[PDB]
Swiss-Prot record, chain C:
It comes from Pseudomonas putida. It catalyses: (2Z,4E)-2-hydroxyhexa-2,4-dienedioate = (3E)-2-oxohex-3-enedioate. GO terms for biological process: toluene catabolic process; xylene catabolic process. This is 2-hydroxymuconate tautomerase. CDD domains: 4Oxalocrotonate_Tautomerase. NCBIfam families: PRK02220.1, taut. Keywords: Aromatic hydrocarbons catabolism, Isomerase, Plasmid. The keyword Coiled coil does not apply. Catalyzes the ketonization of 2-hydroxymuconate stereoselectively to yield 2-oxo-3-hexenedioate. Pfam families: Tautomerase.
From Swiss-Prot, chain E:
The lineage of its organism: Bacteria, Pseudomonadati, Pseudomonadota, Gammaproteobacteria, Pseudomonadales. This is 2-hydroxymuconate tautomerase. GO terms for biological process: toluene catabolic process; xylene catabolic process. Its EC number is 5.3.2.6. Homohexamer. It comes from Pseudomonas putida.
Length: 59, 58, 57, 59, 56, 58
């Protein structure tokens, strides 16, 4: 499985490493897929690049 | 957080529901993000639409 | 500009046509980008494939 | 609805804010989905990372 | 490397197999990447789901 | 056709230009799509942003 996770910028490397680990494990348990087959891409978003209800996250 | 998960076709609805819940919880706990802010998209791939090493995963 | 829009299944073809036109106009006007250069991809999600708060939408 | 928009780098924060607002409203009215449910991600592309016809947008 | 290719519906399985092979080789050779590390996802678009210049 | 290619950061501009050209040509000939219609997006990943088996790929 291949997961792409869009998150807001600002997390530490350590936090993102945890995210990759926990999500990968979750995918593995859910689908009975071998952990080694799971790939995760983290894509960071700047605050001014993410909109909710037409408004900036930065705001 | 918005996660898109590409998986091969063949899983049950029950499995996919579990995937959504477990992944959402993992994201929420890892990032200290509100659970309701987490969105998950499951994208199924037909076997003939996924390649590894230039060959079909068939 | 290239837009991919994930939406729940269930809309008519005409509704999706309107979506493409209106989003394309918005992108062109906002960025002063040539309208003819704007590409929009509609990706439909089955209800059992979209989660909000860990629950099916 | 969730929209991801790939655009070339170079726009101001203000332009991108306008983009997010206008695209979100366009999605909302076209699909009659509540505006507050609409998420928009802006993904900026470097000039050297976007190809048309096998040629860089840089040229 | 991971490539996702959006294409209009209508191509044969044979064409899509060729697409995966040729794109994977192009990525591998261009980036000096191990061929087995290359993944390609084909995503088909219905004609009514793809807009250029605001028109279908 | 529209291709998005996720690759690890570290390549030169020249390498990425070659990638775009060769991938665009491969798409064109494989699908018999006019080359001028082919668009390619390169998306670079930092090493700390890519996981295999729950571990950073690095």
């Amino acid at each position: 499985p291949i997961a792409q996770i869009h998150i807001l910028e600002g997390r530490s490397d350590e936090q993102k490493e945890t995210l990759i680990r926990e999500v990968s494990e979750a995918i593995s348990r859910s689908l009975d897929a071998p952990l080694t087959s799971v790939r995760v891409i983290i894509t960071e978003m700047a605050k001014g690049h993410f909109g909710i209800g037409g408004e900036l996250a930065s705001k």
